[PDB]
Design a protein around this ligand. Structure first.
Ligand SMILES: *[C@H](O)[C@H](C[C@@H]1CCNC1=O)NC(=O)[C@@H]1CC(C)(C)CN1C(=O)c1cc2ccccc2[nH]1
Ligand SMILES: *[C@H](O)[C@H](C[C@@H]1CCNC1=O)NC(=O)[C@@H]1CC(C)(C)CN1C(=O)c1cc2ccccc2[nH]1
Ligand code: NA
Ligand code: NA
Lengths: 301, 301
């Protein structure tokens, strides 16, 4: 037992991280087969960052302007092209450590692991949720761009995120691996705002089930609510509506604990209205929404 | 910016994980050079688990009784020996993926990454602190024994923990890699209690500095306290005494923020006496003590 925020093992992704330099800008790239993927803003300069024309900037580049380093070995760039907000650098060597992989785009409310990297060297791994407002609450410093987010299923790495920028509020924005931004963000040197965020209700309920499985039961009660009466309370506290699909997704956890989803919903209503009265749930004094039902089943089955 | 619980990249340790089976018990082992390390309780049975004589149990074993599997390859055991509560299985092949490593024992209050593994296959990575009472609050299921904890410095893996057991309270106990338990625990099938725990004061202060660096300032005040007056409050709330060495260790963070350690101590006193009044610090509604000063400097420099 126990319940911890838990990342996927990062080895398969570590073997794909390289350093990419253009001019005086260094960031990370992802080396899969004979292509290195990185943020296109590597080609921007201080003179042209407020609103770059990236098409013009790339036309003016040559292969030799890109310095790609895999550990202590320079990789020769033999082609370059733009893919939305990502650059694809074709190199003369296929990465021998290329895992089985896919490029997936994730939905708000889903989680993934981030391998934070600097100068092409992995520094740390943590778990993040894609927020309803298409930001992530990460931990990224200067030089972290090109760090990626991923999930692993069997032996296959599903890449879902590449890091591009930090918003004024200190949250993070980036793209899928096709170079399409999550959310209404653009890769220029401007202060941009995310939409209003909301709490991921289905995840809060999953975490409450995790708590029960781990022996935290104080917040349980004999009451049940209707889906509609619950959603009335949800709206009031800036929680997303709970749907029948969510109820279905929570089915395994409901079966394991013997607590119906609408029974647990009555607990959540009570916690929203009354707070915790000095108590904690799984070591937290607030309601946690960055664990999916899948994440819970992984540690609690 | 941002501040997340962050594990070390796990690749170097992933390349060392194997499966060890004796009889009907399967758990994990750590394969370094030509030795596999695992918990000695792999040789216990349901008939003899309340209080095994491990010396007798090992005398009755042969090399062929140990089945060691590295991925899809059986490793031939050519020697076996006991090292306190660890078994050392000499194998006929040196692990080609052996990193530079050390076996260190850690102190209470220090952190490390855990690579949770089942059937010799890495499942997840998370960060833990060694508690004052020599337990860890981990996430471990049946089959997780032999999973290891570690820190990485440059290219060198410092192994500090191997997992052996779960206490009745749901916290975890294990050994260093020399097979010596952390705390007053023994590897038998009995319910054992840890000593009373305490809060790691120096870590709480480090995390408060992290918060300031990340723009959380509401808990700051114009007051300073003496070390002795602070320790009077610490004792009252089951916090460890703060020492001058701790003040010194916090020096870089104090310099970075311009807030003297004894200034921050006045904030901590106020938070202990008054609570947060509905507010949060770095996304938490309680005071967090599982980040060391080093951990903070890593994400906040
Ligand atoms: C890439 O390494 C870097 C990562 C940032 C640095 C600090 N923490 C991070 O996550 N990205 C950037 O610096 C990106 C590149 C640009 C898209 C060109 C701009 N940028 C921003 O993060 C950026 C610029 C800017 C201006 C005003 C307010 C916020 C703001 N963010
Ligand atoms: C090893 O895979 C396993 C890991 C446990 C299983 C559940 N979560 C974990 O962390 N270890 C054990 O099962 C160890 C082996 C023994 C030392 C022989 C006993 N054991 C315990 O964890 C254990 C036995 C026992 C009895 C009564 C109360 C608690 C208790 N823990
Ligand atoms: Na109920
Ligand atoms: Na103060």
């Amino acid at each position: 037992s126990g319940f911890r925020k838990m990342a996927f093992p990062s080895g398969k992704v570590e073997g794909c991280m390289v350093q990419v330099t253009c001019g005086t800008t260094t960031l990370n790239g992802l080396w899969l087969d004979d292509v290195v993927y990185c943020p296109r803003h590597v080609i921007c300069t201080s003179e042209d960052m407020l609103n770059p024309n990236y098409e013009d900037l790339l036309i003016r580049k040559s292969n030799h302007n890109f310095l790609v380093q895999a550990g202590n070995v320079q990789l020769r760039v033999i082609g370059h092209s733009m893919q939305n907000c990502v650059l694809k650098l074709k190199v003369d060597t296929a990465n021998p450590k290329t895992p089985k992989y896919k490029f997936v785009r994730i939905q708000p409310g889903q989680t993934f692991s981030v391998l934070a990297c600097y100068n092409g060297s992995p520094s740390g791994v943590y778990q993040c949720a894609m927020r309803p407002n298409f930001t992530i609450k990460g931990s990224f410093l200067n030089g972290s761009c090109g760090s990626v987010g991923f999930n692993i299923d069997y032996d296959c790495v599903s890449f879902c995120y590449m890091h591009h920028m930090e918003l004024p509020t200190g949250v993070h924005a980036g793209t899928d691996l096709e170079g399409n931004f999550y959310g209404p963000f653009v890769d220029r040197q401007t202060a941009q705002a995310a939409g209003t965020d909301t709490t991921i209700t289905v995840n809060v309920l999953a975490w409450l089930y995790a708590a029960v499985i781990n022996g935290d039961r104080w917040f349980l009660n004999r009451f049940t609510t209707t889906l509609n009466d619950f959603n009335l309370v949800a709206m009031k506290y800036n929680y997303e509506p709970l749907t029948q699909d969510h109820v279905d997704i929570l089915g395994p956890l409901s079966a394991q604990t013997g607590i119906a989803v609408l029974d647990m919903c009555a607990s959540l209503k009570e916690l929203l209205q009354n707070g915790m009265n000095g108590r904690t749930i799984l070591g937290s004094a607030l309601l946690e929404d960055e664990f999916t039902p899948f994440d819970v089943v992984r540690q609690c089955s």
